[PDB]
Every structure is written in structure tokens, then in C-alpha cells.
Amino acid sequence: MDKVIQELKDLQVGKVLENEPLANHTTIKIGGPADCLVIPKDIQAVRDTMEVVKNHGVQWRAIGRGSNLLVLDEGIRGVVIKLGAGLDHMEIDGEQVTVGGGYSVVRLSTGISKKGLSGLEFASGIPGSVGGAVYMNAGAHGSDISRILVKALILFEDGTMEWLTNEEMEFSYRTSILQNKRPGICLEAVLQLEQKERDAIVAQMQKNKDYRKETQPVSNPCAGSIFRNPLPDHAGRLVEQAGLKGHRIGGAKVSEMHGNFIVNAGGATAKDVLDLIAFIQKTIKEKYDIDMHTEVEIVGEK
Ligand SMILES: Cc1cc2nc3c(=O)[nH]c(=O)nc-3n(C[C@H](O)[C@H](O)[C@H](O)COP(=O)(O)OP(=O)(O)OC[C@H]3O[C@@H](n4cnc5c(N)ncnc54)[C@H](O)[C@@H]3O)c2cc1C
Ligand SMILES: [Cl-]
Ligand SMILES: [Cl-]
Ligand SMILES: [Mg+2]
Ligand SMILES: [Mg+2]
Ligand SMILES: [Mg+2]
DSSP states (O other), X not given: OHHHHHHHHHTTOEEEEEEEEGGGGSTTOOOOEEEEEEEESSHHHHHHHHHHHHHHTOOEEEESSOTTEEEOTTOEEEEEEEOSGGGOOXXXXXXXXXXXXXXXXXXXXXXXXXXXXXXXXXXXXXXXXXXXXXHHTOEETTEEGGGTEEEEEEEOTTSOEEEEETTTTTOBTTBOGGGTTSOXXXXXXXXXXXXXXXXXXXXXXXXXXXXXXXHSOSSSOBOSOSBOOOTTSOHHHHHHHTTOTTOEETTEXXXXXXXXXXXXXXXXXXXXXXXXXXXXXXHHHHHHOOOOOBOSEEESOO
């Protein structure tokens, strides 16, 4: 990978960080080294990076805030592209917002709601990036990205860039086409909001932020909800009903207030988290005969 790293440095793509700990780049603050973590300074830099990747035929993964990732302790091979400050453009034109994939979702929800534009209040507590929200079809409070997205600009591995419409994104619960048929990087999105009375929109937005304070981790690092809900049961309630809140393995524990979040109490390894996940699964399978599946994404090594 030495030469991949070199070409990237020569292209001035932005930061080119060798053996970079993914613990620095995930909300749960866990994870080993990426061989090469690139932090592109702009959209062209992302294209330049992907072309190097294509040439040397190495592995790539795009990340935003790492808010749904449990990266394993031996990190990630190949190139990791973090979309962040280099891709944080944001412009409002009437009821349409055009926003780079690196922009903070919480920031967008906060500022857009303050403009009286309704449709992003639901996202005020989703601590990811726009590109990751598009990839995940992120959702809360009965809404999601699919309700407001007009189109998304995708960079494919082969270097082609294409605007996919809402329908072409094939959104469903926690799902988009980037996860399956058409993998690629979301560089930019156009979102459609609705102009309404500002104060009520701001209120809803803040209400949703308060909801996070009352029911979910604040003091400890954590990733997104761990398990899919085995409907009509909720994973969190099953875990709580089995008395596993606060249950600890190593530095990892089930949060004290929410059964579906594992927090990094301090010093947690990926192994701790994985063990905890398996232990919760065993416990719920024994008690309820339910096999729970992960929603949090496990990445690294393989
Ligand atoms: C406390 C907490 C609360 C959360 N609450 C919610 C919630 O209510 N609803 C919800 O849906 N999620 C929630 N999440 C999960 C997470 O915030 C979202 O899934 C978010 O959309 C992920 O963004 P990232 O930008 O954080 O993605 P990661 O950086 O976390 O990326 C996740 C996946 O998207 C891919 N990816 C990232 N960026 C791109 C890109 N630009 N192009 C293509 N692929 C990309 C990655 O490869 C990976 O597969 C929560 C997380 C935490 C920690
Ligand atoms: Cl950044
Ligand atoms: Cl906790
Ligand atoms: Mg240039
Ligand atoms: Mg027993
Ligand atoms: Mg029994």
C-alpha cells in the first residue's frame, strides 16, 4: 500500500493518514488502524482518491462520523475515505437544500429548523453525516431521509458520477441502493423541505433533542442502536426486561437507560462489544426464543 499512500500524497487530496486508529473516527471511540485514512479536501479530491484505488485495485470504504460503526481491533485494510470538512458545503434555495455528504446531520437539522423549513426536525438527534444518512436512509420519529430526499450525487468506483432520484435510491427501512445493487459514495444531496411557522418547527426540533437526553446515552461514547427490533417487540425493552441494563463486559456495557445501546464506559475493545452482543443474543434467545440481529455495522479485517 506504500505506493497508494504515496500517489495520494502527491495528488494533494487532503490529509493522508497512515495506520490511523478508527477509535479516533467513531462515536463509540473503538477501532484499530486503517492502513490509509484519507480526508478529502473537496469533491475532486474524492475522485482523485477513487481513481488511485481503482488503479491499484485495493479496498475502499467511505465513512462519515463513524456513528454506526464498530470497527474491529485490527482496523481496516486498504483505503478509508472520511467525508467531513472537505465536503461540508450547504446552500438553501427556497424550500430546497443542497448539502455536501460531509455535513453534520445534527447541524443541518438544527439550522434548517431555525429557518422555519420543516422536514428535518426528526433528525436533530442523529449524530451522523449527510452521506451516511443517505446510505442508511437514517430515520427517527416516524420520518427518514427517504421522505425528503430529491436526489443524491453518487461517485461510483469506476469514476462515473450520477444523480440518482429518490425512486432510483430504492429506499426502505434503514436501506438504500448503496447498500446493495449500486455501491458508491454519496457526495452531495438535494433535500426538499416545507416552509412553515418557525417557532413550532424549532420547538419540535428541540423536543427531539430533549428526547435523546432523557432516554439515550449522553455521558459515554456509543454507536447507533445495536439490534434491529424483532417486531412487534422492541430490542431495548427485551434487553431491559431481561435485566441487562448496565451489564458490563470489560470496558463495554449496556447503557443504564436504554437496553438497545452499548456504551463505551471506558477502555472498551471491539472484542468486549462483540462478546456483549453475543451475550445479549444468547440471553434473549433463551428467555424469549428470539434471535436478534444487529443493526450496528461491524467492520474491519475481513
Ligand atoms: C447516539 C446515537 C443515536 C443514533 N440514532 C439514530 C436514529 O435515531 N436513527 C438512525 O437511522 N440512525 C441513528 N444512529 C446511527 C447513525 O447515526 C446513522 O446510521 C448515520 O446515518 C450514520 O452516519 P455516519 O455518517 O455516522 O456513518 P458511518 O460513518 O457511521 O457509516 C455507516 C455506513 O455508511 C457508509 N457510508 C458513510 N458515509 C458514506 C457515504 N458518503 N457514501 C456512501 N456510504 C457511506 C459506511 O460505509 C457505513 O457502511 C445513531 C447513532 C448514535 C451513536
Ligand atoms: Cl473532517
Ligand atoms: Cl450508561
Ligand atoms: Mg482542484
Ligand atoms: Mg443459565
Ligand atoms: Mg424459559
